[PDB]
C-alpha cells in the first residue's frame, strides 16, 4: 500500500490551463444556483434544497452551514466537498485563530484559511481539487459585515452580491439592477428571493429554499446570561415560517 | 483517457470511477428496504442462496454494527465487510471517546466523509457499496440514513436500493402521499415488518417464502436479526388477510 | 511559582437541574493576587466548570475540552453531554499522570437531563448529588453534610451552596472575597450570577493618600510615539 | 533496583610458550557463598586453532564468546574461508567489547 | 516522497536528462576562463535583450566561494545558486574542520560530486549548469582553473569556455593560447579574455563582464570603463 | 513508461543491459596480470588541447595494495571508490590486516544492484580492479554494473576492448614480466586508440608486493613508449 | 504484451509474465546437477567462463555445515537468498541450539521470493538455486524457483540443456537412491548425469564443481584437482 | 478500455477485471476440497506427480493455522502461503488477547478483510488463489471458501481448481443423499473419491493424494492429516468407485 | 502502479527547458498587467486587476498588491491562490531575520529566499511549480530602493522598470522608452499610469480596475512609508495624470 501518488494531479498544458480546476469549475456550473447580497445591517445568503427524492428528509441536508457563530457558509457544486470543507473550516477557525487569540476569526481570515485548503489540492500530490465554490457570509467588529466567493483553484473574492452555479449569469444581471449601498437587511431578503425564484423550477417555498442571514446578535440563542460582552450570534438560519411569511409579500 | 482510471475530474467535471462504482453496487441482484414504525426502524433485504453447496446460514447483507445500529449493504460482499468492520470499530471508538452511543445520522456522516475522501484520493478506490443505517435514535427516535460511493448522505422516511429501487420507491411515495406521515402508523414492529414485505411483494410483483428474505429491526436500545422461522410466523400472517 | 490559587468551590443537585458556586479569591502563597477572579467557567452554553488547584491548568484544560466540545456539537448536530465533557476530560488528565493539576467541579444539563460530576487531576471521576473542591471543601462539606436533603427546589439549592462557599470564605484562609454562582435548569437558560453576594466590602480609608503634584523627582520627560 | 550484573568467580590463567600457548581455568561456577556447578567449562575452542575464555559475569561471558565464535564463522563465509589470525581475533573482539562502551560486558577476557 | 527514476539510461546507453540539461547550458550566456602566468580571468557574456536592468542589485554571473576562490557558470540561473549555495556552506565546514581553506581542485570534486549525485538519485532532475571554478590553493602561487558539467565530470584547463556560441570562443582559445607562454601579466590575460568574447557578444558595451583573480584572497571585477578601455585599443589594431 | 528493475523476455535488465552500451563508449582501459605485478593502463582521451590531461584521472588507489582503472560514465565511479577505499580501511581497523583483492571487489559489486524506485539507475562504469594479498597473489577483476566480477589474467574494456581482448588472447602467457607486461598494455592501447600514443594522452599504474599501488611518472611512461618503438622496428 | 510492465500485473490468461521473464533468466543459466542418497547428498555443476583468460564464475555456495545450495541465473541474487539462509541457519543455531530443517529452510525461501512478486517497485528474482542438506531426517535436495515454487525432489537439474540430466536421473532413480554409505560412487553418477546435459564441451579441471553433505560428512565444495578423479 | 491493466480500477460494467484475471490462475490450478462433516471438516488436495524424482509424501500442500483450523488453495501456491501465514499472525494476536482459540468465522473474516484489502490499490496484485478451510470451535464445526475478490461464504462442501465443476456436482450428491449429515470417516472416504473422480480434468499425468481431518470424536478438534491405514482405506475405497 | 500517472513535472525537453516552467510562464502571461518603476526619491508599483464586475467590493479587494513587511511590498501576476502561499512565507522569513539579527530583512535576500522556494520545486518533489510572476518593490539601508522580479523557474533580476503579466513586450517598450535615471516618483506615477493605458486589453483604463502603490522616503524625515492607494485616490491620481 502506502499512498504512492506523491506527484501533482493537477498541471500546466501548453496554452497555460489548470485543467482540473477548470474542471472542477465546470461542476460547479453545474450545480445548484446559490447567492449572497449584502446589506448596510447585514449579509442574506441562499440556495435551492433541490432534494434528490422527495422520500428523502431534506431538513437533515444542511446546503447553508454555521462556521463560527458570526460567520455562514452556502455552496454550488459537489455536496460532498462542501460538506468535508465545512468540517475543516470549523476545526481551522478553532486551532489556527480561536486557540491562540481566544476569539472567533475575522471573515476575511477564515476564507484565507479555506481558501489556503482549496489551494493546497490544486498542488499536493495524489488528490484532486475541491469541486466547490462557496459563498461566505460574516461579521465582526473591526471589518464589518462581509461577503466572499472562493472557489476550487483556492481565489477569493470580496462581493457586495453575487450568484454562483447553474443560472449565476442571469442571477448576477438581475442583483445588478437592484442592488444599492442603501439596502437594509429585509431589503435584501426580498431581492434574494426574487433573484432565487428565477432559477428555481419547481415547488417555491420554506420547505424548498434554505436562507440563512448575518445580523443582529441573537441573545436569545445563546444559552446563557450573566456575560454583558457575551451578546450571541449574529448567524441566523430561517425557518421554514419566516420564509414563507416573505413570499407573501413578494 | 486516464480521467476514467482514478478518482479525477473528466472534461464535463464528472468522475467516472464513482459512477462505476455505483454499477458495482447491484452486481448481487438484490434490493432492499427500510421503512420507520412509530417506535421502531425495519430494513428488509432479498436473500438468493444460488448455489446447494452453501451454508445458507452465513449468507447475509445485514450487519448489526453496534447495540442500537444496523446496516443493510446493497454491493459486493467483500467492500460490505470492509464497510462493516470500519463501521463496528468507529462506533466503538465513538463511545469510548464521547461516553454515549454513536448516533445513526452521525455513524452515516462519518462513514460518508470516508467514501468523500475515496473520491477525492487518488490511492483510494470507492467502495462499490450503497450503505443504509437504521436505528432508533435516542434524540432523533426511528432513523434511516443512507450512504453510497459517492460520499452522499441523507435522512429517510423510508427508502429503496437494488435493481428495482424505482418501483419500490414509487409504491412508497403512493402510500406517504395517502396517509400524509412521515412515519407507519402502527404499535408493534411486527406489523411494521408485515408492511415492509407486504409492500416490497406489491412492488416487485413476487411472493417470498422464508429464506427468500432477511429481515432486521430497530428497537429502543437493540437493533436484531429475524430468523427465518420468525420471518415465516410474519408471511403467515400476511397471508390470514 | 505557577499560580494555585486557595478556593471553595461546590455544585448541588435539585429538583430541575443544578446549581455550582465559588468564593472569588485568587492567592499567590499567602498573598491575596486577584481579590475578585472568576472561577466558574463555561465549557458550553448549559454546561459549566468550576476549577481549583494549578490555575493555568485549569482553565487551559476547560478551554481546550470547550473548544473539541463545540466542534463535536456542529459535527453531531447535537447539543453536548456533560458526560462528553468528563470523558474527554478525564482521558486527558489520566494521559499526563496528574502532571496537570486540574481539579474540577464539571456540572450541567442536556438532552439527557441533569448531571453533577467531580474530576481529579489524575483522571478519576466521581457522581454525586452534592460535591466540594478546594482548599475549603471540609469547611464547606461540612455545611452540606448538615443541611443538605433529597428533593431540594432552586432557591433552596442555590441558599446551601452559598451557605457552602462562605463557610470557606470565612473559615478557610484561601478562600474568601465574594460569592459566584451559576444555575443550569432544565428547559431554561443557565443564568450566570456574578458576585451573587458581597459580604467583603472593604471600609473607607481613615486617609486620602492623594500626594500634591511634584512630589515625585523626575529625570527626563520625552513623548512616546505609538502612531505609525 | 535491577542490578543487570552479578560475579560468577572463577579464575583462569593463559601463558605464550615459544611454539605453544595453554589457556587453563577452574571449573567452578558460584554466587556469593553458594555452588552452582562444580564442572561448568569457561575456556573453550573458537575454532581455527583459537582458544578464548571471558571470565567474571557469566552471562556476558557467555554472549561475548558465541558472538565471537559467530564472527568466526561469518569471516569464513566474507573471506573465502581464510584462516582467522590470532591478531585479527583481538582486533575484532576488541571492537565487540567497545560496541557496548556504555553498558560493557563484566568480564576480563583472555585468549 | 517522490521518487521517481528521472534520469535513467536508454537503449543506445545515453541519458537523456542529463543530455538535455546540457542543452540548458548551450543556452546560457557565454563564460569564458584564462588562467595566466601568476592570474586567472573570468570573463562572462551578458545579453543586451534586457535593458532598463537594475546593474547594482541584479545578481553578478561571477561568485566568490570563499576569499581566494570564485565559480562562474552557463545556463539555469536558479539552478546555480543551489550549488553556490552549497559550495559556500562546504568552503567553511573545510575551514572549521581540516583549519585549512579549500583547494581549488577539492571545491571543483565538491560542486561536481554534488551535480553527479543528482543524475542518479531518485525524484531529482540534474543541474542545467556547467561551472568554471577558479583561484589559487592556500599559500599557492601557480593559477587554478577548473570545469565541471551536469553529468558530474570536472577537469583542469588551461583555458576553458562554456554556454551559448562556446564553440566559437574555444576555436579561438585554442589557436590563440600558448601554453608555453601564457599571458605573462593581468593586462594580457584580461586581453585574451575580451578579445575570445569579442568573437561572439556583439557590442563591447554592458555585455561583458571581468573578473580578475590573483593569489592571496586578490580578487576584483573590472569596471564598465576599464572593459571598454579594453574594448577600444582590441579595434583599433584590428584597423590593419 | 516501465519499471526501472524490469526484465526483458530474454531474461536480462533493461537498465543493466544500456548501461553496459555507455561503458562501450568510454575510453579503453587494460589490465594484465603477472607473477610479478598486475600492471593497469588507461587511455585518458582529452576532449581538447587546452584540457590539462593530468587532472583526467581514470587510474586511481584503493589502498596500498589494491588499484583500480575505469572506463565509462567516470562520474559514476567516485561513489564506487569511496566505498571501497571506505571498505578497505574497516576491514583493517576491524581486523588489523589487508583485505582480500577478492573481498573488495565483491563489495563494490553490492552495490551495482541496489537500484530501483537506494540510487535510481544502475553505474555507468566498469572497474578493472588490480591487487596483491597474501592468500591469492596478484590479481585482477573486472567488475560489472551488473554486479558481477571475473577474474582475469588480463583485461580490456571501454571503446577499443573486443580488438584489444583478441590481441590479449595472442600475447599473455604465464611467464611474462612485468616490464613485458608494461610494453604489451601500451602496444595495445596504441592500437585501438584513435590519437596517436604518448605520454600525456595514455598512462600506466602497477601493483607490486613489495612497493604497492603506483601511478607512473609521465616520464617514466615516455620511457617505456620509446622501448616500444625501438623493438617493434627491430623486426 | 500490455500485461508484463510490472511484477503487480496478471495477464488477462491469469500469468505473471515478469515472474515467467525471470524464469527465463534460469534458462539461460549453465547447467547444475542435484541427486541424493539415503545417508549423503550431491550437487554437481558446470561453471561458466566469460573467455579463456577468465575464471569460471563459481556456482556452489555454503549455507552452514550441513546445508548449501548452487545456482543458475543472476549470481547477485543467489547471493542475497544464500545470504538470506545463512542467516536463518544461523538464527536457528544460536536461538535455539538447533540445526536448521532444510523442508523449513525451503519455506523460506518460498516466501522471500513470493514478497518480490506481489508488490510495486520491486521485481522477482532471477535465479533459481538446488538446496542440498543432511538433517535430523536424512539427506535432503530441494530445487527453488524465483516463482516461490520450492519442491523436494530425489534429483534434479537446472538451467540450459538440463532436461538431458533429468530424464536420466529419472531413469537412474532406482540406482542412485541406493547408493548408501558410498560418496565417491554417488558422485559418479552426479557426474554421469551431468555430461548428459553437455554440448561440444565436456567437463575439464577448472570446468567442474561439487558440493556433498551428508550422515559424517559436513558441507563441503570440490573445484580444480579435487574434482580430476571424477573426470 | 485499459481498465484491466491496473488493479482497483472499476471498469464501466463496475467490475474489477485484475481480481477476474486472478480466478484465472485459480481455475489453472490443481483441485482442491472441503467437506462439511457431523461432528468437524475434511479437507483433501490433488497433487499432481510431474516426475518419478518428486519424494512421495513430502511436498505437503494443506497448512495448519493454530491447531484447530486446516487451510488447502489452488492456484498460486506461494499466494496460499503468503495467506496462511498472515492467517496465523491474525490467529496468534486474537489468542494473544482474547485467551480462547481464534473462532472460525472470526477467522473467516480475518482473511477476507486481508484478501479485499489487495483489491483497494493498483500497487498490490489480488491473491491468485480461492482457499479452503475451517476447523472446530466452541459453536461446532465451520467450512469456509475464500475468493481473490476477498469474497467468502460458509459451506456444507467445496471444490475448487481445474476440476471444480465435476467435484461440486459430486459434492451436491452427498448434501441431496445426506441431509442428516455424514460422518467424519465417511467424508475421508467421500473426499478420497472426489478428488480421483475430478482427476479426470488432469487425467495426463498421475496423482498423489493428500487428506487432512479436524473432528470433535476423532482428532478432539484438532487438525490432523490423515496417514498410514486410513489414507490406504480411503484410497482403495477411491480406487474401488472409479472401476 | 502509480508510475503510469505521472506527468513528472520537473524534466528537461529535449531541448534543455523545464516544460512546467515554459507552461506557468504562458499561464502568467494571460495575467492583469502588474508594472513597476523606480526612481531616485522611491518606487511605484501599478497593476491592472482583471476583467471586473460592478458588484465586485473594491475597497476590501486585493489580487495585486502585497505588503510583506514595512519596507518591501510585492506585485503579483498569475495565479493569486499560489501568490498567496509564497507571500505568507515571504512575510514569515522576514520576521525571522527581524528576530534572529534585530535588523529588517535586506530586499535582495529575502527574493532570493523565495526564488530558491520556487527553484526547489523545478527539481524535485514532482509536483507542479507555482504559476506566478513577481515583482519586489523594496528598500533597505545598504542598496536604497530596489526592484525586483522573480518567475516560476526561481530566476531573478533587478530592474529600474519592469512589467510582468500581460502584454509585457510593448509595455517594456514604452517603459524603455520614456524612462530616465533622474526621474521622481510624480513623474514614475505617471508613466506607469500612461503605460497600463496603452497596453491594456479593456476599453478604457479606469480606477475600479487599478490597484496602485508607492514606497516613499516622503516618509516624514530618516524613514519610509508604504501607501497602498484607496479606490478614491486612485480616481484622483487618474484625473491628475490626465487619464480620465
Ligand atoms: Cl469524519
Ligand atoms: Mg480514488
Given at each position: ?109 477564515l476564507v484565507s484559511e479555506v481558501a489556503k485548503i482549496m489551494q493546497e489540492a490544486t498542488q499536493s500530490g495524489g488528490v484532486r481539487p475541491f469541486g466547490v465554490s462557496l459563498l461566505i457570509a460574516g461579521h465582526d467588529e473591526f471589518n464589518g459585515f462581509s461577503l466572499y466567493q472562493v472557489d476550487p483553484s483556492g481565489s477569493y473574492f470580496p462581493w457586495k452580491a453575487t450568484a454562483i452555479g447553474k443560472g449565476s449569469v442571469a442571477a448576477k444581471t438581475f442583483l445588478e439592477k437592484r442592488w444599492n449601498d442603501e439596502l437594509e437587511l429585509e431589503d435584501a431578503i426580498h431581492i434574494a428571493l426574487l433573484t432565487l425564484k428565477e432559477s428555481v423550477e419547481g415547488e417555491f417555498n420554506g420547505d424548498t429554499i434554505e436562507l440563512a442571514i448575518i445580523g443582529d446578535e441573537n441573545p436569545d440563542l445563546l444559552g446563557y446570561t450573566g ?24 | ?241 | ?228 | ?111 | ?181 601564457p599571458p605573462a601579466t593581468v593586462e594580457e590575460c584580461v586581453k585574451l579574455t575580451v578579445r575570445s568574447l569579442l568573437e561572439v557578444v556583439q557590442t563591447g558595451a554592458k555585455n561583458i563582464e571581468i573578473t580578475v583573480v590573483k593569489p592571496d584572497s586578490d580578487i576584483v571585477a573590472l569596471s564598465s570603463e576599464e572593459i571598454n578601455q579594453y574594448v577600444t585599443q582590441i579595434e583599433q589594431e584590428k584597423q590593419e | 513508461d516501465r519499471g526501472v528493475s524490469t526484465f526483458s523476455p530474454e531474461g536480462r535488465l533493461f537498465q543493466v543491459e544500456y548501461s553496459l552500451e555507455a561503458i562501450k563508449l568510454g575510453s579503453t582501459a587494460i589490465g594484465i596480470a603477472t607473477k610479478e605485478g598486475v600492471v593497469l593502463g588507461v587511455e585518458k582521451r582529452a576532449t581538447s588541447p587546452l584540457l590539462e590531461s593530468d587532472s583526467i584521472e581514470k ?169 616500444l618503438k625501438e623493438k617493434e622496428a627491430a623486426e | 504484451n500490455n500485461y508484463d510492465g510490472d511484477t503487480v500485473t496478471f495477464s488477462p490468461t491469469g500469468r505473471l509474465f515478469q515472474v515467467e521473464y525471470a524464469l527465463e533468466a534460469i534458462k539461460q543459466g549453465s547447467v547444475t546437477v542435484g541427486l541424493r542418497s539415503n545417508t549423503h547428498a550431491v550437487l554437481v555443476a558446470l561453471k561458466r567462463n566469460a573467455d579463456e583468460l577468465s575464471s569460471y564464475q563459481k556456482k556452489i555456495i555454503k549455507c552452514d555445515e550441513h546445508m548449501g545450495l548452487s545456482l543458475a541465473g543472476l549470481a547477485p541474487d543467489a547471493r542475497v537468498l544464500s545470504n538470506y539462509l545463512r542467516q536463518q541457519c544461523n538464527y536457528s543455531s544460536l536461538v535455539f541450539n538447533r540445526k536448521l530443517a532444510v523442508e523449513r529452510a525451503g519455506h523460506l525461501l ?122 | ?243 | ?244
Open positions: 500500500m502506502t499512498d504512492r501518488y506523491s506527484f501533482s494531479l493537477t498541471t500546466f498544458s501548453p496554452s497555460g490551463k489548470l485543467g482540473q480546476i477548470d474542471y472542477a469549475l465546470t461542476a460547479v456550473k453545474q450545480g445548484v444556483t446559490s447567492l449572497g447580497i449584502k446589506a448596510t445591517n447585514g449579509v442574506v445568503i441562499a440556495t435551492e434544497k433541490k432534494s434528490s427524492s422527495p422520500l428523502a428528509m431534506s431538513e437533515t441536508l444542511s446546503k447553508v452551514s454555521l462556521l463560527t457563530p458570526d460567520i455562514g457558509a452556502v455552496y454550488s457544486g459537489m455536496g460532498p466537498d462542501y460538506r468535508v470543507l465545512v468540517d475543516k473550516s470549523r476545526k481551522v477557525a478553532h486551532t489556527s485563530y480561536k486557540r491562540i487569540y481566544g476569539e472567533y476569526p475575522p471573515t476575511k481570515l456575560i454583558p460582552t457575551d451578546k450571541g450570534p449574529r448567524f441566523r438560519k430561517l425557518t421554514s415560517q419566516e420564509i414563507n411569511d416573505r413570499l407573501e409579500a413578494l | 483517457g486516464y480521467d476514467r482510471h482514478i478518482t479525477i475530474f473528466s472534461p464535463e467535471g464528472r468522475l467516472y470511477q464513482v459512477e462505476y462504482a455505483f454499477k458495482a453496487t447491484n452486481q448481487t441482484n438484490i434490493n432492499s428496504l427500510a421503512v420507520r414504525g412509530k417506535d421502531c426502524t425495519v430494513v428488509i433485504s432479498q436473500k438468493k442462496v444460488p448455489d446447494k453447496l452453501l451454508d445458507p446460514t452465513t449468507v447475509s447483507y445485514i450487519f448489526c454494527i453496534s447495540r442500537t445500529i444496523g446496516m443493510v449493504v446493497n454491493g459486493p460482499i467483500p467492500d460490505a465487510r470492509n464497510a462493516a468492520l470500519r463501521a463496528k470499530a468507529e462506533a466503538a471508538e465513538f463511545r469510548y471517546k464521547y461516553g454515549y452511543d454513536m448516533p445513526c445520522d452521525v455513524l452515516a456522516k462519518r462513514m460518508a466523509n470516508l467514501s468523500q475522501i475515496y473520491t477525492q484520493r487518488a490511492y483510494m478506490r470507492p467502495l462499490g457499496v450503497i450503505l443504509t443505517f437504521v436505528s432508533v435514535d435516542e434524540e432523533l427516535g426511528p432513523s434511516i440514513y443512507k450512504t453510497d460511493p459517492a460520499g452522499y448522505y441523507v435522512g429517510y422516511k423510508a427508502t429503496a436500493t437494488g435493481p428495482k429501487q424505482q418501483e419500490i420507491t414509487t409504491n412508497l411515495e403512493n402510500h406517504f402521499k395517502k396517509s400524509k406521515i412521515d412515519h407507519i402508523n402502527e404499535e408493534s414492529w411486527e406489523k411494521v415488518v408485515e408492511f415492509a414485505i407486504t409492500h416490497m411483494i406489491d412492488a416487485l410483483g413476487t411472493e417470498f417464502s422464508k429464506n427468500d428474505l432477511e429481515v432486521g429491526v430497530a428497537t429502543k436500545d437493540k437493533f436484531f436479526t429475524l430468523s427465518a422461522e420468525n420471518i415465516e410466523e410474519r408471511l403467515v400472517a400476511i397471508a390470514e388477510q | 511559582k505557577a499560580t494555585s490559587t486557595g478556593a471553595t468551590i461546590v455544585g448541588v443537585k435539585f429538583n430541575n437541574g443544578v446549581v455550582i458556586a465559588a468564593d472569588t479569591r485568587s492567592t499567590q502563597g499567602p498573598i491575596v493576587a486577584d481579590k475578585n477572579c472568576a472561577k466558574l467557567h463555561r465549557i458550553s452554553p448549559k454546561i459549566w466548570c468550576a476549577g481549583a488547584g494549578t490555575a493555568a491548568d485549569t482553565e487551559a484544560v476547560t478551554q481546550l475540552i470547550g473548544s473539541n466540545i463545540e466542534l463535536h456539537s456542529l459535527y453531531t448536530s447535537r447539543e453536548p453531554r456533560v458526560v462528553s465533557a468528563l470523558q474527554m476530560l478525564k482521558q486527558h488528565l489520566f494521559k499526563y499522570q496528574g502532571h496537570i493539576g486540574a481539579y474540577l467541579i464539571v456540572a450541567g444539563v442536556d438532552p439527557t437531563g441533569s448531571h453533577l460530576f467531580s474530576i481529579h487531576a489524575h483522571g478519576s471521576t466521581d457522581v454525586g448529588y452534592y460535591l466540594s473542591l478546594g482548599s475549603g471543601s471540609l469547611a464547606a462539606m461540612a455545611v452540606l453534610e448538615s443541611h443538605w436533603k433529597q428533593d431540594l427546589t432552586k432557591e433552596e439549592a442555590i441558599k446551601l451552596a452559598s451557605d457552602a462557599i462562605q463557610a470557606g470564605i470565612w473559615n478557610d484562609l484561601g478562600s474568601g472575597s465574594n460569592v459566584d454562582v451559576c444555575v443550569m435548569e432544565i428547559g431554561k437558560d443557565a443564568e450566570y450570577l456574578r458576585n451573587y453576594l458581597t459580604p467583603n466590602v472593604r471600609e473607607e480609608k481613615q486617609k486620602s493618600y492623594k500626594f500634591p503634584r511634584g512630589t515625585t523627582a523626575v529625570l527626563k520627560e520625552s513623548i512616546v510615539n505609538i502612531c505609525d | 533496583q535491577f542490578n543487570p550484573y552479578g560475579d560468577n568467580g572463577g579464575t583462569i590463567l593463559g601463558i605464550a610458550g615459544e611454539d605453544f600457548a595453554v589457556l587453563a581455568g577452574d571449573t567452578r561456577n558460584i554466587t556469593d557463598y553458594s555452588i552452582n556447578s562444580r564442572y561448568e567449562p569457561k575456556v573453550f575452542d573458537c575454532g581455527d586453532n583459537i582458544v578464548m575464555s571471558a571470565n567474571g559475569f557469566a552471562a556476558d561471558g557467555d554472549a561475548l564468546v558465541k558472538r565471537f565464535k559467530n564472527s568466526v564463522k561469518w569471516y569464513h563465509f566474507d573471506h573465502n574461508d581464510k584462516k582467522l589470525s590470532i591478531n585479527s581475533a583481538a582486533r575484532n573482539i576488541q571492537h565487540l567489547l567497545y560496541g557496548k562502551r556504555f553498558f560493557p560486558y563484566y568480564v576480563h577476557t583472555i585468549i | 516522497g517522490y521518487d521517481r527514476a528521472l534520469s535513467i539510461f536508454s537503449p543506445d546507453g545515453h541519458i537523456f536528462q542529463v543530455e538535455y540539461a546540457l542543452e540548458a547550458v548551450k543556452r546560457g550566456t557565454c563564460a569564458v576562463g584564462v588562467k595566466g602566468k601568476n592570474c586567472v580571468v573570468l570573463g562572462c557574456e551578458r545579453r543586451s535583450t534586457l535593458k532598463l536592468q537594475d546593474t547594482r542589485i541584479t545578481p553578478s554571473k561571477v561568485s566568490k566561494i570563499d576569499s581566494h576562490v570564485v565559480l562562474s557558470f552557463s545556463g539555469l540561473n536558479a539552478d546555480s545558486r543551489i550549488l553556490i549555495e552549497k559550495a559556500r556552506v562546504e568552503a567553511q565546514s573545510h575551514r572549521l574542520t581540516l583549519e585549512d581553506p579549500v583547494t581549488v581542485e577539492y571545491l571543483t570534486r565538491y560542486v561536481a560530486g554534488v551535480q553527479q549525485r543528482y543524475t542518479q538519485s531518485g525524484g531529482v532532475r540534474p543541474f542545467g549548469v556547467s561551472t568554471l571554478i577558479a583561484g589559487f590553493d592556500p599559500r599557492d602561487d601557480e593559477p587554478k582553473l577548473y570545469q565541471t558539467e551536469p553529468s558530474g565530470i570536472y577537469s583542469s584547463w588551461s583555458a576553458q569556455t562554456i554556454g551559448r556560441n562556446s564553440k566559437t570562443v574555444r576555436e579561438f582559445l585554442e589557436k590563440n593560447y600558448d601554453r608555453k607562454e | 587510474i586511481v588507489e584503493i589502498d596500498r595494495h589494491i588499484g583500480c582503472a575505469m572506463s565509462g560514465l567516470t562520474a559514476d565511479a567516485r561513489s564506487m571508490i569511496e566505498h571501497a577505499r571506505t571498505a578497505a580501511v574497516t576491514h583493517n581497523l576491524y581486523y588489523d590486516e589487508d583485505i582480500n583483492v577478492e573481498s573488495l571487489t565483491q563489495s563494490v559489486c553490492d552495490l551495482a544492484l541496489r537500484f530501483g524506485e537506494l540510487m535510481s539507475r544502475p553505474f555507468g562504469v566498469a572497474l578493472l580492479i588490480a591487487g596483491h594479498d597474501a592468500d591469492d597473489g596478484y590479481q585482477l577483476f573486472h567488475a560489472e554494473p551488473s554486479g558481477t566480477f571475473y577474474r582475469y589474467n588480463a583485461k580490456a574494456i571501454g571503446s577499443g576492448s573486443e580488438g584489444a581482448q583478441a590481441e590479449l588472447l595472442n600475447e599473455w602467457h604465464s611467464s611474462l614480466t612485468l616490464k613485458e607486461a608494461e610494453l604489451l598494455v601500451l602496444k595495445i592501447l596504441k592500437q585501438v586508440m584513435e590519437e596517436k600514443l604518448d605520454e600525456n594522452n595514455a598512462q600506466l599504474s602497477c601493483i607490486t608486493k613489495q612497493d604497492g599501488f603506483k601511478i607512473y611518472d609521465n616520464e617514466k611512461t615516455a620511457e617505456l613508449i620509446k622501448e | 518460498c516466501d522471500k521470493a513470493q514478497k518480490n512478486t506481489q508488490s510495486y517497485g520491486g521485481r522477482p528474482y532471477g535465479v533459481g538455486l538446488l538446496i542440498i542438506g543432511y538433517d535430523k531426517s536424512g539427506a535432503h535436495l530441494l530445487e527453488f524457483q524465483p516463482s516461490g515454487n520450492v519442491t523436494e525432489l530425489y534429483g534434479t537439474a537446472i538451467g540450459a540443456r538440463s532436461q538431458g540430466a533429468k530424464t536420466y536421473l529419472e531413469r537412474t532413480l532406482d540406482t542412485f537412491i541406493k547408493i548408501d554409505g558410498n560418496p565417491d560412487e554417488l558422485i559418479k553418477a552426479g557426474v554421469e548425469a551431468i555430461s548428459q546435459s553437455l554440448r561440444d564441451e565436456s567437463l575439464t579441471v577448472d570446468n567442474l564443481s561439487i558440493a556433498i553433505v551428508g550422515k559424517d560428512t559436513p558441507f563441503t565444495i570440490y573445484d580444480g584437482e579435487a574434482v580430476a578423479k571424477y573426470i | 478500455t485499459g481498465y484491466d491493466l491496473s488493479n482497483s480500477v472499476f471498469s464501466p460494467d463496475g467490475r474489477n477485471f485484475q481480481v477476474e484475471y486472478a480466478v484465472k490462475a485459480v481455475e489453472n490450478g490443481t483441485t482442491s476440497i472441503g467437506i462439511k462433516c457431523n461432528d468437524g471438516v475434511v479437507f483433501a488436495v490433488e497433487k499432481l506427480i510431474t516426475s518419478k524424482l518428486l519424494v512421495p509424501q513430502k511436498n505437503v500442500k494443506i497448512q495448519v493455522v493454530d491447531r484447530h483450523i486446516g487451510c488447502v488453495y489452488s492456484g498460486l501456491i506461494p499466494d496460499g502461503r503468503h495467506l496462511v501465514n498472515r492467517g496465523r499472525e491474525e490467529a496468534a494476536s486474537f489468542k494473544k488477547l482474547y485467551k480462547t482459540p481464534i473462532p472460525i468465522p472470526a477467522f473467516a473474516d480475518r482473511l477476507g478483510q486481508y484478501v479485499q484489502a489487495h483489491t483497494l490499490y493498483n500497487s498490490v496484485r489480488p491473491f491468485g488463489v480461492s482457499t479452503i478451510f475451517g476447523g472446530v470451535d466452541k459453536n461446532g464445526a465451520h467450512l469456509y471458501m475464500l475468493e481473490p475478490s476477498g469474497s467468502y461464504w460458509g459451506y456444507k462442501g467445496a471444490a475448487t481448481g481445474k476440476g471444480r465443476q465435476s467435484a461440486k456436482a459430486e459434492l451436491e450428491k452427498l448434501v441431496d443423499h445426506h441431509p442428516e449429515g455424514l460422518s467424519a470417516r465417511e467424508a475421508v472416504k467421500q473426499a478420497a473419491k472426489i478428488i480421483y473422480l475430478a482427476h479426470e480434468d488432469n487425467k495426463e499425468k498421475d496423482f498423489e493424494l493428500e487428506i487432512s481431518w479436524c473432528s470433535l470424536s476423532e482428532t478432539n478438534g484438532l487438525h490432523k492429516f490423515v496417514k498410514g491405514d486410513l489414507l490406504q482405506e480411503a484410497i482403495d475405497f477411491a480406487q474401488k468407485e472409479i472401476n | 502502479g502509480s508510475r503510469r500517472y505521472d506527468s513528472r513535472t520537473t524534466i528537461f525537453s529535449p531541448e534543455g527547458r523545464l516544460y512546467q516552467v515554459e507552461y506557468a510562464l504562458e499561464s502568467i502571461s494571460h495575467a492583469g498587467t502588474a508594472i513597476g518603476i523606480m526612481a531616485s526619491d522611491g518606487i511605484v508599483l501599478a497593476a491592472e486587476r482583471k476583467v471586473t464586475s460592478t458588484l465586485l467590493e473594491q475597497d476590501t479587494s486585493t489580487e495585486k498588491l502585497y505588503k510583506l513587511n514595512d519596507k518591501i511590498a510585492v506585485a503579483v501576476a498569475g495565479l493569486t491562490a499560489d501568490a498567496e502561499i509564497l507571500i505568507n512565507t515571504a512575510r514569515i522569513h522576514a520576521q525571522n531575520y527581524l528576530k534572529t539579527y534585530n535588523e529588517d530583512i535586506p530586499v535582495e535576500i529575502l527574493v532570493r529566499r523565495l526564488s530558491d522556494i520556487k527553484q526547489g520545486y523545478t527539481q524535485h518533489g514532482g509536483l507542479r511549480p507555482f504559476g506566478v510572476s513577481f515583482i519586489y518593490a523594496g528598500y533597505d539601508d545598504r542598496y536604497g530602493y530596489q526592484l525586483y522580479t522573480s518567475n516560476p523557474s526561481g530566476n531573478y533580476t533587478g530592474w529600474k522598470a519592469i512589467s510582468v503579466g500581460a502584454n509585457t513586450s510593448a509595455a517594456q517598450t514604452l517603459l524603455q522608452m520614456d524612462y530616465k535615471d533622474d526621474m521622481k516618483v510624480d513623474d514614475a506615477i505617471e508613466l506607469a499610469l500612461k503605460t497600463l493605458s496603452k497596453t491594456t486589453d479593456s476599453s478604457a483604463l479606469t480606477y475600479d480596475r487599478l490597484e496602485f502603490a508607492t514606497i516613499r522616503k516622503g516618509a516624514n524625515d530618516g524613514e519610509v512609508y508604504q501607501k497602498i492607494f484607496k479606490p478614491q485616490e486612485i480616481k484622483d491620481i487618474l484625473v491628475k495624470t490626465g487619464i480620465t
